[PDB]
Design a protein around this nucleic acid. Structure first.
Lengths: 41, 214, 69, 427
RNA sequence: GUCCUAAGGGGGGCUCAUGGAGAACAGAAAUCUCCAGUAGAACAAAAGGGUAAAAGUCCCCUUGAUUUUGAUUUUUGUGAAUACAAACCAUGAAAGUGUGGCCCCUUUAGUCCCUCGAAAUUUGAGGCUAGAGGAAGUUACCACA
RNA sequence: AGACCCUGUUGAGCUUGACUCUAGUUUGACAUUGUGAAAAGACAUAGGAGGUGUAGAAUAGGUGGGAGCUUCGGCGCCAGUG
RNA sequence: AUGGCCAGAAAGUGGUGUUGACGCAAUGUGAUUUCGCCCAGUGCUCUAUGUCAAAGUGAAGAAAUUCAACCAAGCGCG
């Protein structure tokens, strides 16, 4: 188990959805708004 | 526990049952056993069967649930029987299955029909603890009824108390005594600590004062 | 103070003898804390009486590895 | 609702302090705290009130079991569940029952009945609370069993055979799998399993999540396996889910393995085994799919061996020549299982030494549906009688169950003789 | 926590993987027939060594997968392997083959084992024999060789 | 023969839930420690009484018999409900 | 004050103390002006089950001895 190959083959797990391919690009992102909490001078 | 004590205990038991006070029916000699130093749930619930040399309850009724050939054998041998058509006409009614389980203390089913008994009678026989004993078309049904009558059952349940029937008053002293040692020895063999887990012993008839072996 | 002994401290924490025990572990220092604070102590080689290095320092090895693909 | 948080937890703590100083009664304190617990919007207030209720129960039942207080609180929780099935307020009673069960304060069958009402409810959270109560206590029972156990070339081959005989004896007398005290304390287990299966699993209108349906299925199958219940529609319900495309099919297969037992007919299990074999072990199937299917088949055959036909068994055992290690080990596990249980279906090549020796000498008998052990005499009684006769012959030089009562030393000697005979038969 | 860490011996019969040509449904693939087929199959090393009337596969009997004593090799005792010596066996018509798988503390027992040293009995202990299990830093205050 | 680096079966000062200890302190028991009352607790026994989730005529700890017991009025088995 | 903080091997021993809270003792901060929240953790401090030493108690044995409860403070809990 201590061996470190250059590429690790993914292991198929039964009863679970198939993982995305290694070349799949994920473009989904989440954004948060920065707010400055100071009253008008 | 001394064997001379065993024979004299059954001696006054038979004396009281037959001479001092006799009921209108045949009283049943029975053994009640307590348990100690033993877990009902976290440990194994021991189960076992042993044939007594003499039939303990000759008045016990046994039904036959088999094929037409087994029905012919049963009516030849004078044993009441029911058919798969009768089980179908019951139509899986829980009340009727409960009535059958109360009416017949034991059931013997053919090998062809035992795999369909839980389909036809649902969970009733398993709930009553009366699941039928298989019989083949080559075995002697009279002999089968003989060991079914002569056998007793030793299953643990949620409490530490057990009660078995080891004979009736009508049989004689020495075969009563033999039934007593086979029952006690089989129970001790089933018990995982043997005599160390045995709480107490008690023998009595259907209506008789108890006699404590232990 | 028997209760302040490290053995009694590990028994009251729950960690069983035979588990790995980093040298210097006490009530204030956990294994992660020791591994963090020993980074500031790394950087020294092991030398003999004549001053030559007999065991190399951290990330200072002298060996040439086999670089193949 | 309107008080400051620190002030309101101070008021709760001061009420608990007055209970400790015995100014007020436990019943008065609990009747004060509990409606605020079930109706408060404040999470911190609910958490502290729950903690104080658990502490009050522990302190009350520490010195002696307060049966009246336990009965009143169990009745209150049962009424809370019974009043509104669709409400989510029963999870507090579920959590209280879990905490008191794990602290072993409540060991009666009444908490089991209350959590039975929790299972038989409409709200998903209280249903899975009751399901987790009956399921996750298996780990606590295993921990308790571990604590109880802590409290309690030819020569090498003979030692290995003796170790195998000791393992067989441990299997004969070891704690039963799928065993839990609350599960045994359930009254009418067949009725409970039927109500659960008809309410949650059968109903397609139920919008339960798949994990929660699996929790209910685990409860139903553990009840059926533990109490040897006969629920025929469950096996027909499993048919759709026995597919490799199904999510958590490993959980479904484990549930079916738990549901199977000895008194289940081979007629209902065999289509399930055939479907698992067709969908899981095939030429186009992946190695992991085949290994999972063969493991599930092995577990089902462990629970009931008569489900399988001899041709299918030989086909599945021949998968041990496969190049995948998992499929190989699964097939060898199935082969070994039928080696101890029923070697007659297995090929003469695959039976092994002991199986062929037993079948040739005639000791091994066919296993049939409904057969129960019917030993007319004690096991090893003939060996004990032979030892007694040898001792009598030695005394002369210098029937056992019929006449003599069983001495405990004689029973130990008979057990030792039976172990020696088993070792000789293995050798 | 479940599961796997592999059935050996004797005798007999037959060849494997694959390719080509054919046969209703049947096609790439279901069963059948012939020809070619040095192992390209299988044998529990995935491209090592070795095996074709077999070391492979099937059938029939069997547990040499048994005790005992030495020798050799890997190198005081082991363990493993190697030829035997004695007995008991298996198989085959027999020659033969087969003695496995192609290559330091804790604790238990001892009838007829020995001591507790003034004598004896009973607990207990010791011995011997045979087993089972498993102790941190800092010094820019410094000092010495 | 300084300062600096390196080595040690290194020395010494200091620190800390490092190891083994200790002054002091705290707690319990015996003694010093006498003369009298009132209370309780824990065991031992000698007993006695009890069981509602629903349904059911009733308020079912459970187990095994058991269709007959009977104090001759009935209680039962049967049926109903579990 | 039958006290707090210290000294002393002990003592019918001593300092504060010929003293008494506007005092004694231990600390931190450091003229004047100006200048919230959290008991999370570690400390300190107050109040029936768990942990529970010695002594004492009960049982077994022929005894050595063994097994049981009971079990103060501290710890834990709050």
């Amino acid at each position: 188990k201590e061996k470190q190959k250059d590429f690790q083959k993914p292991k198929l797990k039964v009863g679970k959805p198939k993982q995305k391919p290694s070349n799949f690009t994920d473009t989904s992102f989440k954004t948060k708004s920065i707010v400055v909490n100071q009253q008008t001078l | 526990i001394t064997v001379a004590g065993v024979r004299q205990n059954v001696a006054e038991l038979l004396d009281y049952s037959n001479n001092v006070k006799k009921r209108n029916f045949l009283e049943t000699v029975e053994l009640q056993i307590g348990l100690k130093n033993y877990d009902p749930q976290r440990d194994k619930r021991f189960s076992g069967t042993v044939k007594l040399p003499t039939v303990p309850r000759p008045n016990m009724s046994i039904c036959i649930l088999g094929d037409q050939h087994d029905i012919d054998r049963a009516k030849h041998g004078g044993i009441d029987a029911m058919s798969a058509d009768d089980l179908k006409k019951l139509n899986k009614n829980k009340k009727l299955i409960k009535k059958l389980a109360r009416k017949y203390d034991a059931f013997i089913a053919s090998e062809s029909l035992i795999k369909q008994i839980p389909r036809l009678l649902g969970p009733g026989l398993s709930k009553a603890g009366k699941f039928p004993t298989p019989v083949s078309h080559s075995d002697d049904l009279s002999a089968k009824v003989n060991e079914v009558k002569s056998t007793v059952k030793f299953q643990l349940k949620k409490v530490l108390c057990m009660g078995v029937a080891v004979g009736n008053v009508g049989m004689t002293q020495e075969q009563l005594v033999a039934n007593i040692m086979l029952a006690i020895n089989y129970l001790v063999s089933l018990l995982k600590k043997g005599w160390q887990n045995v709480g107490s012993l008690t023998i009595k008839a259907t209506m008789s004062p108890p006699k404590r072996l232990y | 103070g028997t209760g302040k002994k490290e053995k009694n401290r590990l028994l009251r924490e729950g960690r069983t003898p035979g588990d790995p025990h980093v040298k210097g572990e006490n009530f204030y220092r956990s294994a992660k804390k020791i591994k963090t604070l020993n980074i500031l102590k790394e950087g020294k080689p092991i030398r003999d009486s004549k001053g030559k290095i007999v065991k190399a320092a951290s990330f200072q090895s002298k060996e040439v590895p086999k670089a193949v693909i | 609702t309107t008080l400051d948080k620190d002030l309101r937890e101070k008021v709760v703590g001061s009420l608990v302090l007055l209970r400790r100083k015995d100014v007020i009664d436990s019943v008065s304190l609990l009747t004060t705290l509990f409606p605020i617990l079930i109706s408060s919007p404040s999470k911190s207030l609910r958490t502290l009130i729950y903690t104080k209720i658990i502490s009050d129960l522990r302190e009350s039942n520490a010195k002696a079991t307060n049966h009246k207080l336990n009965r009143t609180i169990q009745t209150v929780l049962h009424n809370l569940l019974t009043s509104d099935r669709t409400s989510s307020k029963g999870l507090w009673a579920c959590r209280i029952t879990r905490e008191l069960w794990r602290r072993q304060i409540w060991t009666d069958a009444r908490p089991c009945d209350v959590m039975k009402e929790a299972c038989l409810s409409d709200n998903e959270k209280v249903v899975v609370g009751g399901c987790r109560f009956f399921l996750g206590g298996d780990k606590e029972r295993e921990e308790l069993e571990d604590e109880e156990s802590d409290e309690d070339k030819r020569q090498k081959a003979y030692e290995k055979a003796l170790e195998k005989i000791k393992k067989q004896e441990r299997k004969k007398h070891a704690p039963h799998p799928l065993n839990f005290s609350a599960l045994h304390l359930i009254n009418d287990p067949q009725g409970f399993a039927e109500k659960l299966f008809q309410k949650h699993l059968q109903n397609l209108k139920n919008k339960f999540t798949l994990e929660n349906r699996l929790l209910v299925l685990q409860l139903v199958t553990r009840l059926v396996g533990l109490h040897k219940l006969t629920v025929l529609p469950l096996y027909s319900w499993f048919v759709r889910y026995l597919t490799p495309k199904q999510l958590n099919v490993t959980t479904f297969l484990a549930c079916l393995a738990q549901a199977t037992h000895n008194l289940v007919p081979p007629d209902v299990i065999e289509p399930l085994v055939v479907k698992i074999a067709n969908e899981f072990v095939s030429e186009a199937s992946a190695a992991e799919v085949a290994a999972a299917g063969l493991n599930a088949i092995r577990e089902v055959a462990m629970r009931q061996p008569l489900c399988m036909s001899e041709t299918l068994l030989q086909d599945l055992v021949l998968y041990q020549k496969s190049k995948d290690k998992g499929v190989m080990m699964a097939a060898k596990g199935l082969q070994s299982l039928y080696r101890e249980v029923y070697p007659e279906m297995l090929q003469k090549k695959f039976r092994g030494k002991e199986a062929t020796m037993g079948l040739r000498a005639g000791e091994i008998k066919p296993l049939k549906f409904g057969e129960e052990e019917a030993a007319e005499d004690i096991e090893g009684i003939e060996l004990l009688e032979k030892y007694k006769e040898e001792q009598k012959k030695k005394k002369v030089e210098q029937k056992l169950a019929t006449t003599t009562i069983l001495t405990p030393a004689d029973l130990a000697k008979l057990k030792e003789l039976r172990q020696q005979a088993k070792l000789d038969k293995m050798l």
